Amino acid sequence: FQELGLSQEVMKAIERMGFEETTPIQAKTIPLSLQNKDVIGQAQTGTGKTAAFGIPIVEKVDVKNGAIQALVVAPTRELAIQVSEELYKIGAVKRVRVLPIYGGQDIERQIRALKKHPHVIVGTPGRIIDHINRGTLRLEHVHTVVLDEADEMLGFIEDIEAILSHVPAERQTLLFSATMPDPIRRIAERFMNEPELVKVKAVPNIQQYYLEVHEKKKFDILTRLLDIQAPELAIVFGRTKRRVDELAEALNLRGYAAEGIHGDLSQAKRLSVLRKFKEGAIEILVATDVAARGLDISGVTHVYNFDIPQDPESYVHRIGRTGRAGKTGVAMTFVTPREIGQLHHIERTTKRKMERMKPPTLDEALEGQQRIAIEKLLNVVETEFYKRAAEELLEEHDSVTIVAACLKMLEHH
Amino acid sequence: SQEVMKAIERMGFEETTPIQAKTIPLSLQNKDVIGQAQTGTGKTAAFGIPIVEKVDVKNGAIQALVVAPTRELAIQVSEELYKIGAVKRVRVLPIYGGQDIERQIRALKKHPHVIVGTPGRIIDHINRGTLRLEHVHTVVLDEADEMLNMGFIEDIEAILSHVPAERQTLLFSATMPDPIRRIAERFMNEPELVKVKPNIQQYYLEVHEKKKFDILTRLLDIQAPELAIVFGRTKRRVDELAEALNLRGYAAEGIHGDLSQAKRLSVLRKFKEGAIEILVATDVAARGLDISGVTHVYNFDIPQDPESYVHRIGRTGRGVAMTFVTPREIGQLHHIERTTKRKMERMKPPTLDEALEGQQRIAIEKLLNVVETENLSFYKRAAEELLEEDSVTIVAACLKMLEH
Known part of the structure; x- marks a missing residue:
């Protein structure tokens, strides 16, 4: 199903991740997105929506161009890291360079990573807008913006608007969200161009x-x-x-x-x-x-x-x-x-x-190591030249003392 | 010299041993010396110091040859001579049988100052022209009595024939049987004899x-x-x-x-x-x-x-x-x-079983140490209920898991 017009550097990073057949969200959004159309993907994780936007981004990056060419905005450092990791792997063969940008990290460590000229930035709104005001993040060659898990970024709205103010008007914009509250709609109307909606219908193990x-x-x-x-x-x-x-x-x-x-x-x-x-x-x-x-x-x-x-x-x-x-x-x-x-x-x-x-209390934990050792021990005898050494050992000490000592050692890590 | 003194002081060397106090001044006067001393007297530095002090590091030719009975000794001596000349940057290459000659031929390209080698393998390189001795002006025969025992005399004599007639010769041996005396008598110039007479x-x-x-x-x-x-x-x-x-x-x-x-x-x-x-x-x-x-x-x-x-x-x-x-x-x-x-x-x-019993013995001594040193109150009740589902059987299972 991944028989779209995809390059080989991409198709080969993709297989190493075990990608064979496409999911609906990928099947439907990737062609539109490869035609450079604005896309709104309404679907929860894990329908494969992350790869749905990650592929076209890596496909359209020019690795010779040392400028930031794509921006993915995410609500949290956790998602920024997960998404960057997945995009990294998608663009590993082609050698696309992804840098996560988020809160709670030393902004200097981020200035430092920026010098390496990443192609794709995936980041947090407050922190992106932060680097922007300090000129360390320059977005003039960005022609792809993705808003991901957008319903979670509904404060954030003001930073997202300020970020977009610095990105070229001429650009592809993609928005992914499980739900579409009307403030999402407002974003779509104002910042996206003729967006195509792709909706997928929403383990106990x-x-x-x-x-x-x-x-x-x-x-x-x-x-x-x-x-x-x-x-x-x-x-x-x-x-x-x-x-x-x-x-x-x-x-x-x-x-x-x-x-x-x-x-x-x-x-x-x-x-x-x-x-x-x-x-x-x-x-x-x-x-x-x-x-x-x-x-x-x-x-x-x-x-x-x-x-x-x-x-x-x-x-x-x-x-x-x-x-x-x-x-x-x-x-x-x-x-x-x-x-x-x-x-x-x-x-x-x-x-x-x-x-x-x-x-758990410390006592419950201690009782716990005890219950495990005792039960492993019972299994040993039950299911499988040890006896003579046991005999000679029992010849000079009480059997309780011996077993007590065995349990102490057994229970130790 | 300074670069030699640093390297040996930074090695621990401070006071000279007898073989060193007696041989080194003669060697530094470029004299032929016969050190009769067994190992553990510092005889190795006794000859290693003068060689290193005598090397011109700007000359890329082999300037000293140490001949040794075995690969093991050739390595040990190379290793000590290297350290002795680490600061002056003296290049030492060992050369012995059993190793692919082509690798040695390679190493010989990198211009060693000192060769430490075994007699059979040295003449091999001589005959091939991979070892050039035209510039060697110090030859050491080390552990000479063992080299005669191993039947190396014709090789040692052949080796001396390609070395320049103008050269210092040092001979170290624990014993001095007649074939060593004769070699010293035939091949050395005015040799000075220095004789030196656990848990x-x-x-x-x-x-x-x-x-x-x-x-x-x-x-x-x-x-x-x-x-x-x-x-x-x-x-x-x-x-x-x-x-x-x-x-x-x-x-x-x-x-x-x-x-x-x-x-x-x-x-x-x-x-x-x-x-x-x-x-x-x-x-x-x-x-x-x-x-x-x-x-x-x-x-x-x-x-x-x-x-x-x-x-x-x-x-x-x-x-x-x-x-x-x-x-x-x-x-x-x-x-x-x-x-x-x-x-x-x-x-x-030991047999397979004796190896097993040894492992057993060790696990037991650890167990017995616990018994003797530690409070086991916490485990007593769990042990008593265990001793319900016999004494021997439980311990044996415990022992089974105490030994992976």
């Missing part, structure tokens, strides 16, 4: 929990959960590189097998980490949203949102890392008091209510 | 080549050394030994010549810090390693001469040393004993 916890408490609740649930393979999502690094390190110092992945790592390093995770050489991948989509690993049984993803679309992709191929998944999201609203908004958007889970 | 448990195992690796790992399982060095004869055997050890779950890394500054330093950092349990090494790590806490040395390949052996095992005991000896190497093993005057105890190669 993932169990979804949240926990209300203070920041200072998150780490111990995490390790306690890990002690109780002992996941085969888990992903812990965090908000920043630093938090992901510190989290992986803290876990490793507690004896868990964990590694961090984020945007500052080289392609070489991230592939190495993903290999280690895939093969289960580590039990726990700690990650930013750079690892929320298209991982091609099927054994993840638990996802922990150490830091709540701010927008529903990023949330959905994060938890969908588990529950792959019909098998049951567990998703747990840590919510600070001030984030309860964001959590409720996520629930109303997915139409799936989450179950509140009580944070 | 490591030494073992050997008689093991067939094909069985060496399994014996090595069984030993590792039993002894579980905190920090071990395993010496191998060639780069290739060292890398393969390192690889095969890793595949078996041991934390090991290989070290040898032709690595890189960063790889060599990381391997040495991991070893010094205990990030790996076993360093696998050619003789490049026999001297000047400067790493503390090595409890075990395994000679996977027997070192052919006693001086190389002594410096390999001296890596520990700063200890246990184990040398694998194939049946055809049994004579060499005894030659080493007579030369060092310490008999080695013969250890029986």
